[PDB]
Amino acid sequence: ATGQDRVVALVDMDCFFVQVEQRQNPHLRNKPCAVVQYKSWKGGGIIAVSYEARAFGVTRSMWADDAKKLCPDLLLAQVRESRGKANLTKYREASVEVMEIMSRFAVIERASIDEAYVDLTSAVQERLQKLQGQPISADLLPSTYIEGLPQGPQKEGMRKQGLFQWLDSLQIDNLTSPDLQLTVGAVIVEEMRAAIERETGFQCSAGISHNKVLAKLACGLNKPNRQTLVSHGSVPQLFSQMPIRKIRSLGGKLGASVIEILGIEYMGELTQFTESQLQSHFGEKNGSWLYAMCRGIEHDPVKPRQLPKTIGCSKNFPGKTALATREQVQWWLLQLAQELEERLTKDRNDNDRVATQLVVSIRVQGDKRLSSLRRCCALTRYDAHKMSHDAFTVIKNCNTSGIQTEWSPPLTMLFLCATKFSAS
DNA sequence: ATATGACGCT
DNA sequence: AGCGTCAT
Ligand SMILES: Nc1ncnc2c1ncn2[C@H]1C[C@H](O)[C@@H](COP(=O)(O)NP(=O)(O)OP(=O)(O)O)O1
Ligand SMILES: [Mg+2]
Ligand SMILES: [Mg+2]
């Protein structure tokens, strides 16, 4: 079995937060520009970067002041600030706009604020028998790249040349040629992407392949404003120089042990190993997953979920701003709870459901662990004061100070999350 | 002094 | 459950 039964696509917005600000502020269009959070510490932290500005080496996580050094024409748009914290509402709403449109073509799984996976298998079947064996016209694929093509014996001319070899080798006879199915999926994604641009003004990229992992890999091969098809046949060469860390779920500790333990560098080298070999190295689940994946085979299904299982608000208090007093802790819990009550009310009305669990998370000054304590209490009413007061209770026994007016050690992070939803 | 949401392990 | 891992 070759892991070619499904057509899966990943759609990801190009420099999402920038496009949202550029739609709103025409003066930012087609300029080096970036979106910044806060302002006081070193101009604010950069969180999204137009492609014009990336050409100067401006990146996410860079301070705005350091970014202006790399690029002094850089324009900045500031994230909105409510009750003393970053407020991402504009971008969540833009995301819903984009998800609604995508939903009209197939069932989607929201994977982040700006991307969704799409299972196109069923829509591919439909469009196939409508064609009645009609060949696929390169007219229908004006922004599609075929990975690994052209091959054998100017940016856009190279694209068409690869696209011509793909079609000129296609087998439109067999209505289950996996390569034909990917080509038809790619035709739908062009329609989906034109509709998103038409109805929002947002441009996006997309990957089309047989599973989530290849779709996501393909999406980033030709950003921005292009889509890439990765066929099962292109996987051996693609993977032969693909660093292991580029693959989703291997960008961290597991991927680094794969490199260290096996002494390899690229995804294609995993094929030498037996599945049993890989299970003893990395456990039974990772070994099986890896054995299949280095052959381009992956089974994670596209889950029909476009809303979330959790709604959270958090704020970091780094350095001098760490929370030292009880009354400081209570004020910020109030602020978090107020924004949280706002989003929960919106979610109970628009999507018809109610949370039953409140999770409270904190980080103390000196703990490397991104969260230090994580406790849960009942959630019965969408009332900020009640939520904020209950969060304090759950954490108040963690102020290790005999002075009760004081909070020690200082808190570096407050996090309030609502979960365990039920239909309402 | 790089705000969020999913899922795995035990 | 609470923690860890990984993602954008
Ligand atoms: N580590 C992070 N932390 C917080 N917000 C982030 C983030 N990474 C991204 N965002 C925010 C800002 C981002 O705009 C948005 C989508 O994340 P991406 O798709 O990873 N990056 P973009 O869409 O900007 O560029 P392109 O896709 O063309 O590479 O979510
Ligand atoms: Mg994006
Ligand atoms: Mg993204």
Tab-separated table of C-alpha atoms (C1' of nucleotides) and ligand atoms in Angstrom:
chain	number	residue	atom	x	y	z
A	1	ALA	CA	0.000	0.000	0.000
A	2	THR	CA	1.274	3.399	-1.065
A	3	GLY	CA	-0.769	5.862	0.993
A	4	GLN	CA	-2.563	7.353	-2.026
A	5	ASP	CA	-6.253	6.899	-1.211
A	6	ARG	CA	-6.858	10.470	0.011
A	7	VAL	CA	-6.471	13.915	-1.495
A	8	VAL	CA	-5.488	16.351	1.273
A	9	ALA	CA	-4.693	20.057	0.957
A	10	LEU	CA	-3.289	22.638	3.336
A	11	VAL	CA	-4.227	26.290	2.796
A	12	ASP	CA	-2.184	28.915	4.642
A	13	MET	CA	-2.577	32.696	4.390
A	14	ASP	CA	0.423	34.706	3.213
A	15	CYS	CA	1.751	36.986	5.990
A	16	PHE	CA	-1.716	36.863	7.532
A	17	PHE	CA	-1.660	39.644	10.122
A	18	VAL	CA	0.058	41.920	7.589
A	19	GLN	CA	-2.654	41.343	4.954
A	20	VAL	CA	-5.350	42.074	7.546
A	21	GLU	CA	-3.667	45.377	8.352
A	22	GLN	CA	-2.985	46.070	4.667
A	23	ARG	CA	-6.635	45.565	3.715
A	24	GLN	CA	-7.628	48.053	6.429
A	25	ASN	CA	-4.830	50.587	5.695
A	26	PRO	CA	-4.191	51.011	1.935
A	27	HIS	CA	-1.098	53.062	2.767
A	28	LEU	CA	0.602	49.839	3.936
A	29	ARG	CA	0.021	47.955	0.678
A	30	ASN	CA	3.039	46.794	-1.326
A	31	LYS	CA	5.496	48.192	1.202
A	32	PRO	CA	8.038	46.739	3.616
A	33	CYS	CA	5.880	46.449	6.691
A	34	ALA	CA	5.282	44.384	9.773
A	35	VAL	CA	2.867	43.923	12.660
A	36	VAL	CA	4.148	44.746	16.156
A	37	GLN	CA	2.936	43.846	19.654
A	38	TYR	CA	3.426	46.483	22.390
A	39	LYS	CA	5.850	49.373	21.938
A	40	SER	CA	7.816	50.298	25.027
A	41	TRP	CA	10.476	47.586	25.272
A	42	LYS	CA	12.657	48.152	22.170
A	43	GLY	CA	9.793	49.336	19.955
A	44	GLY	CA	7.644	46.240	20.418
A	45	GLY	CA	8.039	42.659	19.244
A	46	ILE	CA	7.511	41.791	15.581
A	47	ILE	CA	4.902	39.080	14.969
A	48	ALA	CA	4.297	39.183	11.196
A	49	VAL	CA	6.294	40.463	8.236
A	50	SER	CA	5.357	41.294	4.656
A	51	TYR	CA	7.475	39.618	1.989
A	52	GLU	CA	8.926	42.952	0.872
A	53	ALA	CA	10.243	43.382	4.425
A	54	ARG	CA	11.532	39.782	4.641
A	55	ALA	CA	13.777	40.619	1.671
A	56	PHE	CA	15.608	42.892	4.157
A	57	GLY	CA	15.891	40.050	6.666
A	58	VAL	CA	13.132	41.242	9.022
A	59	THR	CA	11.767	38.232	10.896
A	60	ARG	CA	9.222	37.296	13.525
A	61	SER	CA	10.453	37.594	17.157
A	62	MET	CA	12.784	40.426	16.159
A	63	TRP	CA	12.398	43.652	18.127
A	64	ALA	CA	10.955	46.503	16.096
A	65	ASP	CA	13.976	48.695	16.870
A	66	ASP	CA	16.377	46.028	15.620
A	67	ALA	CA	14.133	45.541	12.576
A	68	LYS	CA	14.329	49.257	11.702
A	69	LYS	CA	18.125	48.880	11.760
A	70	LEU	CA	17.891	46.118	9.132
A	71	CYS	CA	15.230	48.026	7.208
A	72	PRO	CA	14.643	51.729	7.960
A	73	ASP	CA	11.686	52.133	5.533
A	74	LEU	CA	9.773	49.467	7.500
A	75	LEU	CA	6.175	50.455	8.155
A	76	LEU	CA	4.565	49.148	11.343
A	77	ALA	CA	0.998	48.331	12.300
A	78	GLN	CA	0.303	47.850	15.978
A	79	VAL	CA	-1.780	45.089	17.460
A	80	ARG	CA	-4.803	46.464	19.263
A	81	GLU	CA	-4.510	46.721	23.057
A	82	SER	CA	-7.441	46.095	25.427
A	83	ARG	CA	-7.359	46.061	29.235
A	84	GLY	CA	-3.568	46.194	29.118
A	85	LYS	CA	-2.940	43.213	26.862
A	86	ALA	CA	-2.699	42.318	23.196
A	87	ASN	CA	-6.123	41.815	21.599
A	88	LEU	CA	-6.112	39.612	18.499
A	89	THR	CA	-9.852	39.901	17.767
A	90	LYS	CA	-9.413	41.473	14.322
A	91	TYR	CA	-7.358	38.512	13.152
A	92	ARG	CA	-9.661	35.862	14.629
A	93	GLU	CA	-12.529	37.518	12.730
A	94	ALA	CA	-10.513	37.680	9.493
A	95	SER	CA	-9.741	33.967	9.976
A	96	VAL	CA	-13.443	33.100	10.328
A	97	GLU	CA	-14.125	34.964	7.075
A	98	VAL	CA	-11.532	32.828	5.313
A	99	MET	CA	-12.660	29.568	6.949
A	100	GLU	CA	-16.314	30.191	5.984
A	101	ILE	CA	-15.354	30.484	2.311
A	102	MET	CA	-13.173	27.359	2.396
A	103	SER	CA	-16.082	25.473	3.995
A	104	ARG	CA	-18.165	25.915	0.823
A	105	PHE	CA	-15.859	23.537	-1.065
A	106	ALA	CA	-15.089	20.715	1.359
A	107	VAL	CA	-14.807	19.861	5.020
A	108	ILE	CA	-11.940	21.642	6.749
A	109	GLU	CA	-9.898	21.237	9.920
A	110	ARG	CA	-8.732	24.528	11.386
A	111	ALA	CA	-5.068	23.971	12.142
A	112	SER	CA	-4.129	27.517	13.263
A	113	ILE	CA	-5.433	31.067	13.039
A	114	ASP	CA	-4.425	31.190	9.363
A	115	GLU	CA	-4.518	27.663	7.983
A	116	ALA	CA	-6.854	24.758	7.405
A	117	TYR	CA	-6.441	21.252	6.051
A	118	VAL	CA	-8.961	20.123	3.443
A	119	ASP	CA	-10.053	16.580	2.579
A	120	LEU	CA	-10.788	16.784	-1.136
A	121	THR	CA	-11.246	13.065	-1.814
A	122	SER	CA	-15.052	13.277	-2.156
A	123	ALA	CA	-14.999	16.522	-4.138
A	124	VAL	CA	-12.358	14.997	-6.425
A	125	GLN	CA	-14.627	12.017	-7.187
A	126	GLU	CA	-17.491	14.382	-8.033
A	127	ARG	CA	-15.513	16.630	-10.376
A	128	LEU	CA	-13.950	13.536	-12.021
A	129	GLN	CA	-17.158	11.985	-13.413
A	130	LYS	CA	-18.478	15.386	-14.490
A	131	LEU	CA	-15.415	15.710	-16.732
A	132	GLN	CA	-16.260	12.409	-18.467
A	133	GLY	CA	-12.606	11.697	-19.198
A	134	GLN	CA	-11.945	15.254	-20.351
A	135	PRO	CA	-8.214	16.119	-20.177
A	136	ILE	CA	-7.132	18.692	-17.617
A	137	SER	CA	-6.203	22.018	-19.173
A	138	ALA	CA	-3.175	23.939	-17.929
A	139	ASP	CA	-5.507	26.959	-18.110
A	140	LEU	CA	-7.158	25.581	-14.999
A	141	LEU	CA	-3.898	25.653	-12.977
A	142	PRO	CA	-2.518	29.200	-13.358
A	143	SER	CA	-0.645	29.227	-10.032
A	144	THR	CA	0.233	25.551	-9.492
A	145	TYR	CA	3.763	24.153	-9.203
A	146	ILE	CA	4.528	20.446	-9.680
A	147	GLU	CA	7.268	19.480	-7.256
A	148	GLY	CA	10.296	17.904	-8.906
A	149	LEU	CA	9.306	19.062	-12.414
A	150	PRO	CA	10.582	20.009	-14.952
A	151	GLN	CA	13.252	17.347	-15.222
A	152	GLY	CA	15.376	15.378	-17.647
A	153	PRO	CA	16.736	16.340	-21.115
A	154	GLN	CA	12.707	32.760	-15.864
A	155	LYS	CA	10.499	32.026	-12.871
A	156	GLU	CA	7.090	31.631	-14.525
A	157	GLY	CA	8.321	29.865	-17.659
A	158	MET	CA	9.869	27.215	-15.429
A	159	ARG	CA	6.455	26.770	-13.800
A	160	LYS	CA	4.550	26.171	-17.047
A	161	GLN	CA	7.278	23.843	-18.317
A	162	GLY	CA	6.929	21.678	-15.209
A	163	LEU	CA	3.146	21.850	-15.469
A	164	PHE	CA	3.233	20.768	-19.100
A	165	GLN	CA	5.365	17.692	-18.323
A	166	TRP	CA	2.960	16.726	-15.545
A	167	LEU	CA	-0.155	16.809	-17.722
A	168	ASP	CA	1.602	15.441	-20.820
A	169	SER	CA	2.320	12.365	-18.677
A	170	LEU	CA	-1.130	12.119	-17.111
A	171	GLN	CA	-3.424	9.094	-17.411
A	172	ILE	CA	-6.914	10.643	-17.566
A	173	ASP	CA	-8.333	7.199	-18.455
A	174	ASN	CA	-8.263	5.491	-15.026
A	175	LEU	CA	-10.641	7.400	-12.715
A	176	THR	CA	-8.450	6.195	-9.752
A	177	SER	CA	-5.027	7.262	-10.953
A	178	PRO	CA	-3.797	8.955	-7.767
A	179	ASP	CA	-1.828	11.472	-9.878
A	180	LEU	CA	-4.998	12.463	-11.721
A	181	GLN	CA	-6.818	12.779	-8.407
A	182	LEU	CA	-4.137	15.173	-7.103
A	183	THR	CA	-4.393	17.193	-10.320
A	184	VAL	CA	-8.158	17.526	-9.881
A	185	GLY	CA	-7.768	18.431	-6.211
A	186	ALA	CA	-5.358	21.142	-7.340
A	187	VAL	CA	-7.996	22.502	-9.704
A	188	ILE	CA	-10.451	22.878	-6.838
A	189	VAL	CA	-7.859	24.569	-4.621
A	190	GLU	CA	-7.276	27.156	-7.352
A	191	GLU	CA	-11.031	27.839	-7.289
A	192	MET	CA	-10.987	27.942	-3.471
A	193	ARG	CA	-8.028	30.322	-3.488
A	194	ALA	CA	-9.563	32.603	-6.101
A	195	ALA	CA	-12.759	32.821	-4.042
A	196	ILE	CA	-10.836	33.717	-0.866
A	197	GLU	CA	-8.995	36.470	-2.709
A	198	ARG	CA	-12.167	37.643	-4.436
A	199	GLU	CA	-14.223	37.841	-1.253
A	200	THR	CA	-11.620	38.959	1.278
A	201	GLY	CA	-8.692	40.407	-0.646
A	202	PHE	CA	-6.392	37.960	1.185
A	203	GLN	CA	-3.843	35.949	-0.804
A	204	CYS	CA	-2.785	32.482	0.296
A	205	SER	CA	-0.623	29.512	-0.615
A	206	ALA	CA	-1.549	25.848	-0.623
A	207	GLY	CA	-0.113	22.350	-0.655
A	208	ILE	CA	-1.917	19.418	-2.295
A	209	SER	CA	-0.817	15.855	-1.644
A	210	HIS	CA	-2.047	12.589	-0.123
A	211	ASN	CA	-1.749	13.436	3.566
A	212	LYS	CA	-1.456	16.326	6.013
A	213	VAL	CA	2.306	16.126	6.355
A	214	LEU	CA	3.023	16.279	2.637
A	215	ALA	CA	0.360	18.925	2.095
A	216	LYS	CA	1.948	21.131	4.734
A	217	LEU	CA	5.413	20.513	3.316
A	218	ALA	CA	4.188	21.342	-0.214
A	219	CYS	CA	2.434	24.538	0.910
A	220	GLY	CA	5.745	26.150	1.902
A	221	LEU	CA	7.656	25.148	-1.249
A	222	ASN	CA	6.401	28.082	-3.352
A	223	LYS	CA	5.191	30.845	-1.047
A	224	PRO	CA	3.662	33.402	-1.501
A	225	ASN	CA	0.458	33.312	-3.592
A	226	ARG	CA	1.197	29.950	-5.246
A	227	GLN	CA	0.185	26.338	-4.706
A	228	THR	CA	2.281	23.182	-4.984
A	229	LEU	CA	1.291	19.592	-5.816
A	230	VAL	CA	3.486	16.878	-4.303
A	231	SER	CA	2.858	13.485	-5.851
A	232	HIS	CA	3.732	10.186	-4.252
A	233	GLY	CA	6.302	9.728	-7.031
A	234	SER	CA	8.116	12.947	-6.169
A	235	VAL	CA	8.740	11.890	-2.563
A	236	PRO	CA	12.029	9.908	-2.871
A	237	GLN	CA	13.898	12.833	-4.448
A	238	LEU	CA	12.181	15.497	-2.316
A	239	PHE	CA	13.038	13.581	0.827
A	240	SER	CA	16.562	12.730	-0.298
A	241	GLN	CA	17.720	16.189	0.808
A	242	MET	CA	14.871	17.139	3.128
A	243	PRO	CA	16.259	17.823	6.629
A	244	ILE	CA	14.378	15.753	9.178
A	245	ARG	CA	13.337	18.846	11.169
A	246	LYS	CA	11.351	20.291	8.251
A	247	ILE	CA	8.671	17.574	8.726
A	248	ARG	CA	5.748	18.382	11.025
A	249	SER	CA	6.191	16.805	14.505
A	250	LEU	CA	9.952	16.364	13.942
A	251	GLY	CA	10.877	20.030	14.433
A	252	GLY	CA	11.718	19.464	18.104
A	253	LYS	CA	13.141	16.903	20.532
A	254	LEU	CA	11.993	13.742	18.747
A	255	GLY	CA	13.476	14.906	15.442
A	256	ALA	CA	16.764	15.773	17.165
A	257	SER	CA	17.027	12.324	18.711
A	258	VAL	CA	16.344	10.811	15.266
A	259	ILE	CA	19.389	12.718	14.004
A	260	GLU	CA	21.564	11.890	17.024
A	261	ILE	CA	20.548	8.268	17.524
A	262	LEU	CA	20.495	7.214	13.871
A	263	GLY	CA	23.374	9.453	12.775
A	264	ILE	CA	21.386	10.684	9.752
A	265	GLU	CA	20.407	14.117	8.428
A	266	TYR	CA	17.731	13.767	5.737
A	267	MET	CA	14.271	12.228	5.663
A	268	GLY	CA	15.218	9.761	2.909
A	269	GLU	CA	17.848	8.030	5.003
A	270	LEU	CA	15.125	6.633	7.292
A	271	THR	CA	14.179	4.125	4.586
A	272	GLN	CA	17.166	1.874	5.304
A	273	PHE	CA	15.756	0.987	8.719
A	274	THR	CA	13.182	-1.671	9.534
A	275	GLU	CA	9.989	-0.716	11.315
A	276	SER	CA	11.021	-2.844	14.304
A	277	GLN	CA	14.394	-1.068	14.364
A	278	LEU	CA	12.614	2.276	14.507
A	279	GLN	CA	10.174	1.200	17.210
A	280	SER	CA	12.925	0.177	19.612
A	281	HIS	CA	14.660	3.525	19.066
A	282	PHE	CA	11.627	5.821	19.283
A	283	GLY	CA	8.749	3.787	20.696
A	284	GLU	CA	6.029	1.820	19.002
A	285	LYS	CA	3.982	4.808	17.788
A	286	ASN	CA	6.793	7.062	16.548
A	287	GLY	CA	8.644	4.142	14.944
A	288	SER	CA	5.600	3.058	12.928
A	289	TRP	CA	4.823	6.676	12.080
A	290	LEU	CA	8.412	7.250	10.913
A	291	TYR	CA	8.654	4.019	8.905
A	292	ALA	CA	5.541	5.033	6.964
A	293	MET	CA	6.406	8.750	6.738
A	294	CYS	CA	9.843	8.466	5.133
A	295	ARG	CA	7.951	6.712	2.317
A	296	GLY	CA	5.428	9.557	2.123
A	297	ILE	CA	2.743	7.544	3.917
A	298	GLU	CA	0.809	9.098	6.804
A	299	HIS	CA	-2.646	8.387	8.160
A	300	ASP	CA	-3.659	11.383	10.333
A	301	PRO	CA	-7.214	12.153	9.178
A	302	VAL	CA	-8.637	15.578	8.373
A	303	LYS	CA	-10.924	16.111	11.343
A	304	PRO	CA	-14.223	17.925	10.637
A	305	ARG	CA	-13.544	20.628	13.265
A	306	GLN	CA	-13.264	24.343	12.412
A	307	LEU	CA	-14.057	25.810	15.891
A	308	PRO	CA	-11.923	25.035	19.003
A	309	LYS	CA	-11.888	22.851	22.092
A	310	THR	CA	-10.328	25.559	24.261
A	311	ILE	CA	-10.531	29.332	24.538
A	312	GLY	CA	-7.715	31.080	26.363
A	313	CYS	CA	-6.221	34.417	27.359
A	314	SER	CA	-2.670	34.783	28.561
A	315	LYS	CA	-0.132	37.517	29.179
A	316	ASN	CA	3.581	37.389	29.945
A	317	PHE	CA	5.047	39.761	32.541
A	318	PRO	CA	8.752	39.583	31.721
A	319	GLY	CA	11.565	41.115	33.713
A	320	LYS	CA	10.758	44.190	35.768
A	321	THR	CA	7.010	43.825	35.158
A	322	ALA	CA	6.729	40.525	37.046
A	323	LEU	CA	3.793	40.471	39.449
A	324	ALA	CA	4.941	41.085	43.028
A	325	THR	CA	1.801	42.055	44.963
A	326	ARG	CA	-1.463	40.261	45.621
A	327	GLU	CA	-3.504	43.214	44.396
A	328	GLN	CA	-1.465	43.186	41.179
A	329	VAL	CA	-2.215	39.491	40.690
A	330	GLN	CA	-5.931	40.089	41.250
A	331	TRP	CA	-6.104	43.043	38.871
A	332	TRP	CA	-4.579	41.123	35.973
A	333	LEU	CA	-6.710	38.024	36.624
A	334	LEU	CA	-9.691	40.348	36.387
A	335	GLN	CA	-8.429	41.746	33.057
A	336	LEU	CA	-7.823	38.272	31.623
A	337	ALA	CA	-11.226	37.084	32.843
A	338	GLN	CA	-12.976	40.104	31.313
A	339	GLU	CA	-11.517	39.413	27.873
A	340	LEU	CA	-12.233	35.732	28.424
A	341	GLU	CA	-15.861	36.375	29.326
A	342	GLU	CA	-16.134	38.424	26.117
A	343	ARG	CA	-14.968	35.540	23.918
A	344	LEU	CA	-16.979	32.886	25.756
A	345	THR	CA	-20.193	34.887	25.384
A	346	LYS	CA	-19.432	35.307	21.676
A	347	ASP	CA	-18.786	31.570	21.392
A	348	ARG	CA	-21.965	30.596	23.295
A	349	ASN	CA	-24.111	32.680	20.931
A	350	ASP	CA	-22.427	32.224	17.561
A	351	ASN	CA	-21.533	28.542	17.905
A	352	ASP	CA	-24.063	27.401	20.542
A	353	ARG	CA	-22.085	25.773	23.384
A	354	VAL	CA	-20.815	26.393	26.924
A	355	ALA	CA	-17.537	25.660	28.738
A	356	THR	CA	-17.522	23.708	32.020
A	357	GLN	CA	-13.857	23.781	33.045
A	358	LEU	CA	-11.584	26.710	33.868
A	359	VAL	CA	-7.855	26.026	33.771
A	360	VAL	CA	-5.476	28.478	35.464
A	361	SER	CA	-1.781	28.561	34.638
A	362	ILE	CA	1.117	30.591	36.034
A	363	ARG	CA	4.881	30.847	35.660
A	364	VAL	CA	7.174	32.023	38.459
A	365	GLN	CA	10.424	33.927	37.986
A	366	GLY	CA	13.192	31.362	37.501
A	367	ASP	CA	11.287	28.317	36.200
A	368	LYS	CA	12.519	27.142	32.808
A	369	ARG	CA	9.245	25.256	32.297
A	370	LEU	CA	6.979	27.463	30.190
A	371	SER	CA	4.215	26.689	32.686
A	372	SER	CA	4.917	26.019	36.373
A	373	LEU	CA	1.487	25.113	37.782
A	374	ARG	CA	-1.701	24.225	35.912
A	375	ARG	CA	-4.888	23.749	37.943
A	376	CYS	CA	-8.539	23.345	36.938
A	377	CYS	CA	-11.737	24.457	38.669
A	378	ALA	CA	-15.425	24.382	37.806
A	379	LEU	CA	-16.806	26.923	35.348
A	380	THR	CA	-20.504	27.614	35.982
A	381	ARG	CA	-21.078	31.252	34.973
A	382	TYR	CA	-19.577	33.483	32.290
A	383	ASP	CA	-18.836	36.238	34.803
A	384	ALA	CA	-15.382	37.824	34.928
A	385	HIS	CA	-15.349	38.578	38.669
A	386	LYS	CA	-16.408	35.027	39.489
A	387	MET	CA	-13.881	33.509	37.083
A	388	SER	CA	-11.094	35.824	38.225
A	389	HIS	CA	-11.864	35.278	41.895
A	390	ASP	CA	-11.964	31.491	41.432
A	391	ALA	CA	-8.658	31.515	39.580
A	392	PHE	CA	-7.030	33.289	42.514
A	393	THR	CA	-8.301	30.680	44.971
A	394	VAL	CA	-6.803	27.867	42.907
A	395	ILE	CA	-3.385	29.609	42.900
A	396	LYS	CA	-3.399	31.610	46.165
A	397	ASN	CA	-1.692	28.796	48.102
A	398	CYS	CA	1.325	29.194	45.776
A	399	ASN	CA	2.365	32.644	47.069
A	400	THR	CA	5.192	31.397	49.306
A	401	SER	CA	5.230	34.554	51.437
A	402	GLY	CA	4.258	35.132	55.065
A	403	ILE	CA	3.489	38.723	54.123
A	404	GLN	CA	0.103	38.173	52.465
A	405	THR	CA	0.116	41.602	50.815
A	406	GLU	CA	3.210	40.406	48.929
A	407	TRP	CA	3.524	37.751	46.238
A	408	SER	CA	6.740	35.759	46.158
A	409	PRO	CA	8.335	34.499	43.994
A	410	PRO	CA	6.999	36.868	41.295
A	411	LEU	CA	4.643	35.609	38.586
A	412	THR	CA	6.018	35.734	35.028
A	413	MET	CA	2.834	34.526	33.320
A	414	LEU	CA	-0.945	34.436	33.761
A	415	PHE	CA	-3.050	32.079	31.628
A	416	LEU	CA	-6.823	31.519	31.786
A	417	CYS	CA	-8.352	28.817	29.569
A	418	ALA	CA	-11.943	27.602	29.207
A	419	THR	CA	-12.475	24.027	28.052
A	420	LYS	CA	-14.637	20.900	28.382
A	421	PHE	CA	-17.426	22.273	26.194
A	422	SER	CA	-20.945	20.872	25.723
A	423	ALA	CA	-23.778	21.744	23.338
A	424	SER	CA	-25.925	24.727	24.343
B	1	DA	C1'	12.333	40.626	27.493
B	2	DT	C1'	9.999	35.262	20.906
B	3	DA	C1'	-0.638	34.795	22.546
B	4	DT	C1'	-2.659	31.085	21.725
B	5	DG	C1'	-4.355	25.928	20.633
B	6	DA	C1'	-3.726	20.622	19.900
B	7	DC	C1'	-2.434	16.318	21.441
B	8	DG	C1'	0.601	12.644	24.068
B	9	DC	C1'	2.191	10.427	28.371
B	10	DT	C1'	1.159	8.469	32.683
C	1	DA	C1'	-5.342	15.108	36.181
C	2	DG	C1'	-1.223	17.655	35.588
C	3	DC	C1'	2.638	17.673	32.910
C	4	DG	C1'	5.247	17.688	28.423
C	5	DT	C1'	5.787	18.421	23.396
C	6	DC	C1'	4.919	20.724	19.172
C	7	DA	C1'	2.952	23.783	16.519
C	8	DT	C1'	1.509	28.963	14.406
D	1	LIG	N1	5.224	31.834	16.919
D	1	LIG	C1	4.057	32.668	16.636
D	1	LIG	N2	3.598	33.166	17.775
D	1	LIG	C2	2.511	33.979	17.745
D	1	LIG	N3	1.885	34.305	16.573
D	1	LIG	C3	2.365	33.808	15.429
D	1	LIG	C4	3.439	33.005	15.464
D	1	LIG	N4	3.739	32.635	14.213
D	1	LIG	C5	2.843	33.211	13.395
D	1	LIG	N5	1.983	33.944	14.126
D	1	LIG	C6	0.911	34.726	13.827
D	1	LIG	C7	1.251	35.848	12.840
D	1	LIG	C8	1.055	35.316	11.638
D	1	LIG	O1	0.725	36.306	10.596
D	1	LIG	C9	-0.179	34.297	11.815
D	1	LIG	C10	0.027	33.094	10.885
D	1	LIG	O2	1.267	32.414	11.182
D	1	LIG	P1	2.291	31.886	9.941
D	1	LIG	O3	1.452	31.368	8.798
D	1	LIG	O4	3.248	30.907	10.503
D	1	LIG	N6	3.202	33.175	9.365
D	1	LIG	P2	2.517	34.274	8.168
D	1	LIG	O5	1.153	33.901	7.747
D	1	LIG	O6	2.594	35.686	8.689
D	1	LIG	O7	3.544	34.267	6.933
D	1	LIG	P3	3.603	33.019	5.842
D	1	LIG	O8	2.544	32.062	6.161
D	1	LIG	O9	3.398	33.630	4.518
D	1	LIG	O10	4.994	32.424	6.041
D	1	LIG	O11	-0.165	33.900	13.052
D	2	MG	MG	0.633	32.038	6.920
D	3	MG	MG	0.230	29.404	9.258
